[PDB]
Subunit: 518 residues, 2 copies
C-alpha cells in the first residue's frame, strides 16, 4: 500500500496541479493512518486549490475525531475559519455551530456559539433550501440553556426567520403559534405574509433551478438577472454565491459578481475577498487579475502588497501574448497614478521609469520566448511611455528615442502610426520636428498615403514658408505619382491574369471531347 | 448690311464675352468700311481676348495701308508690340521687320530693324518650319545696305543660322559656300553636322504632328514629353508655345507649361507673362488663378497688384462651389505668409484676421446665394483660422469660438470633427478642456461613437485619476448600450 503512496507523492512533485492526484494521495494516507502526513498533504492542497464542501468536511470530521485536548478545539476552530472562505457552505456552518456548543462552560463558550450562528445566518440565513436548518439549530441551542426568561431570545429567532422567505416556512409559523403562550403580534403576521409573497415570487426560479441539472448555469443567470432588478444587496450576494458554487470556473460570472461589488457595495473587506477568490478559481484570465489590482488601488491597499500580487499574476500562466501586455499595462497605470507630476524628480517616478524598462525587456525576453511572436505588435507600452514622458515630464527627447524604436518595427507603413507620433510632436515638440516626422510619413506610409500628404500640406499651408509649401507639394506629388503608378500597373497585371484565364478557358471550348477513354 | 451690325452691337452691350460675335462685328465693319468704328471694335475685343495671328495680321494690314504719315509709324510699331504678346507669331514678326525697313532713312532706323529681327529670332528662330523665313529676311536686309564691311554681319548670320536645325537647311549650307570666297571653316561645318543630326531626331515627331487633324493635341503632348527628356529650355518653350497656338483652350496644357517655368527656369519676367496669358485663355479654371498668385508671391510682386489680381479672380466666374473656397484659400495662405507672428501689433496680421472674416461672409452670402451650399461643408477655412489663431497667436479663446460655431452647423455628430478639435485643445489648451471636449464628443458623436470612447479611455488611463477612468467607463458603457439599443429597435 505504501508503494502506491510513493507513486502519487512523486507524481505531485513533478506536477502539483493535479487536483485528483492530491485527492488520491489524501485518501490513501488517511487509510494508512498517517495522521501528520494527511494533514500536511491537506494543508498543501488547500493552499493551491479552493476546496469543495465535501473535502473540507472530511478534513473537519477527521480533526474533530482526534481532538482530545482543549488546544485541539482551538485548532479545529481555526480550520473551520479556513473552510468558510472558499465558497458558501451551509453544512460547514451548521457543523461549526454544533461543534462550538461543546465548549460551553468555558469563558467565552456561550458568546462564541452565538457568534458563529449569527455569522452563519448573515451568510446563509436567506438560503431558500438550506438556510432553514441553521435557524432551527440556533433556536434549539437557545431553548436548551434556558427555561423562563432567555425566552425573549428564542422569540426573536422565530420572529427574525418568519420575515424571511424560506422553504417550509409555513410549518415554522405553525410551530411558533403552539410554542408561544403570548399571542403572535399583528406585525409578525404581516411580515410573514409579505415573506410568503416573496416565497411565491422566487418559487419559479427555485424550481427551474431544481428541474435543470447540472451546473445549471443558464438557470442561475436568469435568477441573478431577476435579483438585480429587485435590488436587495444581501439577496444579490447570496444568489451570486449560490451560482458560483457549481460554476466556479466561469470567469464571466466572477466578473459579473465582482463588478456589482465594485460599483455598488464598495465594502473593502468584501470586494477584495471576492476578487481573491476569483483569482484562485480562474488564474488563467488576466481581466480577473487586472480588476483585482484596480480594486486594491481604489481601497488604499498598501503599495507592497499590491506589488506582490502583481508579481503573482506574472507567474499564473496565460494562453495569449496579448494577455501579458494587459497585466503589465494595468500595473504600469497603477505606478503612474502614484507619481506627482507637478515635481520632477520623484522616487515614485524613478520606480515608474524602472518598471517600463523591465516591462519592455520582459516583453523582449519571456513572452517572445514562449509564444515566438512579440506580445505588443503596435508597441502600445512604448507609446504610453512616450506620451507620459513628453506631456507629463519635460522629456520630449525620450519620447523621440522611443518613437524611433517603435517605427523601425515595420510600423513605419501605417498612417495612424505617423500621426500618433506627429500629434505628439505637435503638442510638445517644435514645428521643425513635425515637419520632419511628416516628411518621413510621406516617404514610408503604405496604407493611406493620400491621407498623410494632406496632413503635411495642411501644416505647411498654415505654418510654413513658401519654400516649405513648395517642397511639400513636390514630395507629395512625387510620392503620389509613384503610388498611382504601382496601383495602376498592378491593375494591369490582374487584368493580364484574367485575359490569361480566358485563353485557358478558350482552349477548353475548342477541345471539348464529350467522350473520354484516357 | 448695316442692319446686322446694329444687332451685334447691342448683343455685345448685353454680353461682352461673345468671342465669335466680336469676330463677326469686325468682319462686317471691315467690309463696310467704317474705318473709325473698326479700330474701336478691334481695341475693345483685344483687351478682352487674345487674338489669333490672322486677326492681328488683318488689323495690321489696315493700319499700314492707311499709312497716315503724320507720323503713325511709331503708332503702328505700338500695335506690333501688342500683337507679338498673345501667341507665337512668325508671320507677325516677319511682317514687323519688312515694315520697319521703311524707316531706315530716319534716325536709328537701322538699330530698330536689327532689334526686331533679333527679337523675332529669339522667339521663333528655332521654329522648324517657319523660322527660316525670318533668317532669310534678316540676311536680305543686311546684304542690301553695304558693299565692303557689313559683309561680316551677313557672314555671322549665315553661320548663326547654320548652327540651328531648320527644314531645307542643306540648301543654305550649299548657298553659303558659293557666296563665301573663303572656305567654310571646320567649326561651322561640325555645328552644321550635329544640327543635321538634330533634324533627324525630331523628324518622326514633326511628321506625326503633320498627319493628324488639328488641334492634334495628343500628338503635341508626345512632342513635349520628348523635348523635356532632352531638357533644352529654349526648345521646350517652343513646342509648348506651338501647341498652345492650336490648343489654347486646354487648361491642363497651360498648367504643365507654367509649372515647367516655375520649377525649372524660375525667371520672373518669363513665368509671369505665361501665367497672365493663361488666365486670359482659360479664366474659368481656378487652378490657373491660384498658381498665378503663387508665382507672384514667389517672385516678390508688389502686395497691391497681387490683391487686384486676386479681386479679378472673384469676378471670373466658376462652375463649382468648391472653386470659390479654393481661391479664397490661396489668398488667405498668401496673407498669412506676410505676417510676422513674433510681432503682435501686427499690421499684416490684422489684414489677415480681416481677410478671414470677409471670406467666411462671401461663402455665406455670395457663394450660398448662387449655389445654396457653402462650398466648404467641413469648414476647413474656420479650421485653419482656429489653428493659426491658437498655435501662432496666443488666442486660444478665438479658436474655441470658431470651433463652437463649426459644431453648431451640424458637425457635432462627426467623430473626426471632435478629434480635430480635441487635438487642438490637446496641443494649446489644458487637460481640463480636453476632458470636456471628449465628454461632449461621447454624447454627440453619431457615426463612430465606439472610436471616440477609445480615445477618452486612453486619455484617462494615461493622465487621469482612477476616478476619472471610472467615470469614463460609465459614460462610454451607457452611450454604447443606448446606441446598441437603437440598432435593434430602429
Amino acid at each position: 500500500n505504501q508503494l502506491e503512496i510513493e507513486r502519487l507523492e512523486e507524481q505531485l512533485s513533478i506536477n502539483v496541479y493535479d487536483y485528483n492526484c492530491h485527492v488520491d494521495l489524501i485518501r490513501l494516507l488517511r487509510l494508512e493512518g498517517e495522521l501528520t502526513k494527511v494533514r500536511m498533504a491537506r494543508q498543501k492542497m488547500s493552499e493551491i486549490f479552493p476546496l469543495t464542501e465535501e473535502l473540507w468536511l472530511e478534513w473537519l470530521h477527521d480533526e474533530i475525531s482526534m481532538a482530545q485536548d482543549g488546544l485541539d478545539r482551538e485548532h479545529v476552530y481555526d480550520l473551520f475559519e479556513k473552510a468558510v472562505k472558499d465558497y458558501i457552505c451551509p453544512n460547514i456552518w451548521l457543523e461549526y455551530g454544533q461543534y462550538s456548543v461543546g465548549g460551553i462552560g468555558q469563558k467565552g463558550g456561550l458568546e462564541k456559539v452565538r457568534s458563529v450562528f449569527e455569522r452563519a445566518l448573515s451568510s446563509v440565513g436567506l438560503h431558500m433550501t438550506k438556510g432553514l436548518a441553521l435557524w432551527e439549530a440556533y433556536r434549539e441551542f437557545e431553548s436548551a440553556i434556558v427555561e423562563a426568561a432567555r425566552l425573549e431570545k428564542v422569540h426573536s429567532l422565530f420572529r427574525r426567520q418568519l420575515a424571511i422567505p424560506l422553504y417550509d416556512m409555513e410549518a415554522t409559523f405553525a410551530e411558533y403559534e403552539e410554542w408561544s403562550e403570548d399571542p403572535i403580534p399583528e406585525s409578525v403576521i404581516q411580515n410573514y405574509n409579505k415573506a410568503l409573497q416573496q416565497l411565491e415570487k422566487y418559487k419559479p426560479y427555485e424550481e427551474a433551478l431544481l428541474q435543470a441539472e447540472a451546473p445549471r448555469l443558464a438557470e442561475y443567470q436568469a435568477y441573478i438577472d431577476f435579483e438585480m432588478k429587485i435590488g436587495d444587496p444581501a439577496r444579490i450576494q447570496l444568489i451570486f454565491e449560490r451560482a458560483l458554487v457549481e460554476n466556479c470556473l466561469v470567469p464571466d460570472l466572477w466578473i459579473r459578481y465582482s463588478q456589482y461589488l465594485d460599483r455598488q457595495l464598495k465594502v473593502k473587506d468584501l470586494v477584495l475577498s471576492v476578487h481573491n477568490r476569483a483569482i484562485r478559481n480562474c488564474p488563467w484570465t488576466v481581466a480577473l487579475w487586472s480588476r483585482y489590482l484596480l480594486a486594491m488601488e481604489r481601497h488604499g491597499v498598501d503599495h507592497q502588497v499590491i506589488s506582490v500580487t502583481f508579481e503573482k499574476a506574472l507567474n499564473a500562466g496565460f494562453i495569449q501574448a496579448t494577455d501579458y501586455v494587459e497585466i503589465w499595462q494595468a500595473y504600469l497605470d497603477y505606478l503612474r497614478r502614484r507619481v506627482d507630476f507637478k515635481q520632477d524628480s520623484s522616487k515614485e517616478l524613478e520606480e515608474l521609469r524602472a518598471a517600463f524598462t523591465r516591462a519592455l525587456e520582459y516583453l523582449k525576453q519571456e513572452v517572445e520566448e514562449r509564444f515566438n511572436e512579440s506580445g505588443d505588435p503596435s508597441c502600445v507600452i512604448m507609446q504610453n511611455w512616450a506620451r507620459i514622458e513628453a506631456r507629463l515630464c519635460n522629456n520630449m527627447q525620450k519620447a523621440r528615442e522611443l518613437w524611433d524604436s517603435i517605427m523601425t518595427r515595420g510600423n513605419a507603413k501605417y498612417a495612424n502610426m505617423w500621426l500618433e507620433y506627429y500629434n505628439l510632436e505637435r503638442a510638445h515638440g517644435d514645428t521643425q520636428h513635425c515637419r520632419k516626422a511628416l516628411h518621413r510619413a510621406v516617404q514610408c506610409t503604405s496604407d493611406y498615403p493620400e491621407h498623410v500628404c494632406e496632413v503635411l500640406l495642411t501644416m505647411e499651408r498654415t505654418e510654413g514658408s513658401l519654400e516649405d509649401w513648395d517642397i511639400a507639394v513636390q514630395k507629395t506629388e512625387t510620392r503620389l505619382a509613384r503610388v498611382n503608378e504601382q496601383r495602376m500597373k498592378a491593375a494591369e497585371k490582374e487584368a493580364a491574369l484574367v485575359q490569361q484565364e480566358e485563353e485557358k478557358a478558350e482552349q477548353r471550348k475548342r477541345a471539348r471531347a464529350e467522350k473520354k477513354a484516357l
